[PDB]
Symmetry: C3
Subunit: 153 residues, 3 copies
Amino acid sequence: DVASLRQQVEALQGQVQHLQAAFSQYKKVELFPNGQSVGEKIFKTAGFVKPFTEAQLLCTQAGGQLASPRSAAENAALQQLVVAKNEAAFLSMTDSKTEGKFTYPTGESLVYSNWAPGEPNDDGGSEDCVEIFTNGKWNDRACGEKRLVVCEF
Amino acid sequence: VASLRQQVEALQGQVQHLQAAFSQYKKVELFPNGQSVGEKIFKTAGFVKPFTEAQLLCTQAGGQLASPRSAAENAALQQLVVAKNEAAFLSMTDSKTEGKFTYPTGESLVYSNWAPGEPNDDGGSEDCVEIFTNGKWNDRACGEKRLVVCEF
Amino acid sequence: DVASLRQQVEALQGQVQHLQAAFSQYKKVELFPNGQSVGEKIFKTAGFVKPFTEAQLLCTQAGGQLASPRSAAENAALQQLVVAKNEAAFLSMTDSKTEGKFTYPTGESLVYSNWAPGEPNDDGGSEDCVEIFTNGKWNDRACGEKRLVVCEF
Ligand SMILES: O=C(O)C(=O)C[C@@H]1O[C@H](CO)[C@@H](O)[C@@H]1O[C@H]1O[C@H]([C@@H](O)CO)[C@@H](O)[C@H](O[C@H]2O[C@H]([C@@H](O)CO)[C@@H](O)[C@H](O[C@H]3O[C@H](CO)[C@@H](O)[C@H](O)[C@H]3O)[C@@H]2O)[C@@H]1O
Ligand SMILES: O=C(O)C(=O)C[C@@H]1O[C@H](CO)[C@@H](O)[C@@H]1O[C@H]1O[C@H]([C@@H](O)CO)[C@@H](O)[C@H](O[C@H]2O[C@H]([C@@H](O)CO)[C@@H](O)[C@H](O[C@H]3O[C@H](CO)[C@@H](O)[C@H](O)[C@H]3O)[C@@H]2O)[C@@H]1O
Ligand SMILES: O=C(O)C(=O)C[C@@H]1O[C@H](CO)[C@@H](O)[C@@H]1O[C@H]1O[C@H]([C@@H](O)CO)[C@@H](O)[C@H](O[C@H]2O[C@H]([C@@H](O)CO)[C@@H](O)[C@H](O[C@H]3O[C@H](CO)[C@@H](O)[C@H](O)[C@H]3O)[C@@H]2O)[C@@H]1O
Ligand SMILES: [Ca+2]
Ligand SMILES: [Ca+2]
Ligand SMILES: [Ca+2]
Ligand SMILES: [Ca+2]
Ligand SMILES: [Ca+2]
């Protein structure tokens, strides 16, 4: 029975090696041209624009959330997608509860930001959502405007 | 046996890490053109075709045209139709026996969601089925062009 | 002890058998409708057009390269995507001004080719890139024209 278990372990090693190698190829295929991997996070664009409320619902129904960069490296990876599509995108964070205090959907306060000079400026008094430009910088923006839909998984 | 335990313990971690990575890439795969329901996956091509061309695309890809067999499956399919704002073909036809809709296997329907007054065989020649944005079904001529959605 | 190993191996067998089924289904989902697998090579189209230099960059940044069919079987698989999108696509190969002829990106001479009759013809004196037509035949084409982006992985 030690001999039999040894045979079974050897077969499993071969099967796991096969899946690892096959899946490694498919990761690259899948992310071309609308995805970007950075650390343990994956950004994926829908390739079209929506208002914030509708963008948020699409990401949540897909089992993820709107793009939420938590470091300069995550932000630069997101910027790569935004540049390639040439369309600014919504982020997840809003200051709807408390004006000036932007938070994640959980209510946690920001661990990273990349605001353009002078932003947030609440231009017109009702900019409660956040966009990322093609240069990677952030701007507060009215939630009713349409921007590129990018989710994180 | 001591070597075997080391090898088994190593496999536990490798398999755990592979399943996590696979699960994450599968979620990414389905956004925004797919829907998972039970063991079934629907995926839209994002364009319209006549029935025979749509059928061939799905079969060449190793699947078949969307074939909702329950209310839950129909609702999942309805989400893609609503997202693209384009009615889609189902797999089922009454080509062989008028009035008797079947799956590609020849099996009779186990579920239906016909709109009021349907199926009506309009013009004496509606043998394919479209699903609308409200999730209801209408029989339609097979030569019309509709959203291509396959199941896998 | 041996009883312990048997319980661990039985669990692992269940997990791997599930992954094999799930992965095989997933491959079909990913390849529909923009991918084609041939031997150990996968072609995937971006589903849009670009000039050559931008096309080449997109493939390299994704961890692949521009489509480079090396056999009749590979060419016929690529032709299926080109036919499906009804758009001729760029290949990887270019006219080397040091070698005085078409080469792969490495500088090596072409082996397999499928030139259309009368090609390459350097029409107008500046056709330094290569495209594949919807009939599968090859044509030299100006690099600044926009053609379907297809990468290989
Ligand atoms: O961004 C948009 O598309 C807008 O919504 C532009 C709008 O145009 C009107 C201009 O009077 C405003 O209603 C609004 O522009 C303000 O708000 C913008 C965003 O916060 C909206 O969310 C902001 O980007 C604008 O500033 C930028 O553009 C102006 C100007 O070109 C707009 O026409 C620039 O003067 C400005 O740059 C200057 O200020 C910066 C920050 O203090 C400095 O870093 C820079 O050196 C200055 O030159 C900036 O580019 C505007 O506030
Ligand atoms: O609504 C849109 O999005 C359109 O762009 C279609 C156009 O909009 C107006 C809608 O009122 C119409 O002027 C026009 O719709 C005609 O053209 C459509 C196609 O060209 C593209 O889809 C066609 O589908 C329409 O027919 C459908 O809707 C009408 C009606 O509700 C709205 O016009 C139905 O009467 C019709 O259903 C009947 O005919 C079907 C066969 O054509 C039968 O299967 C069905 O059993 C009948 O009840 C169909 O649902 C319209 O001709
Ligand atoms: O959009 C384009 O492809 C072009 O760039 C068209 C341009 O039109 C001008 C015509 O003077 C030229 O500047 C250029 O067309 C030549 O170059 C084309 C490509 O090499 C561009 O990279 C080429 O496809 C053209 O050839 C085709 O058309 C001629 C045409 O004069 C009459 O139809 C055909 O003689 C030629 O025939 C060859 O291909 C056939 C299969 O399609 C074979 O049956 C035949 O034996 C061949 O000789 C071809 O159809 C042109 O050279
Ligand atoms: Ca605000
Ligand atoms: Ca602002
Ligand atoms: Ca009928
Ligand atoms: Ca009808
Ligand atoms: Ca030519």
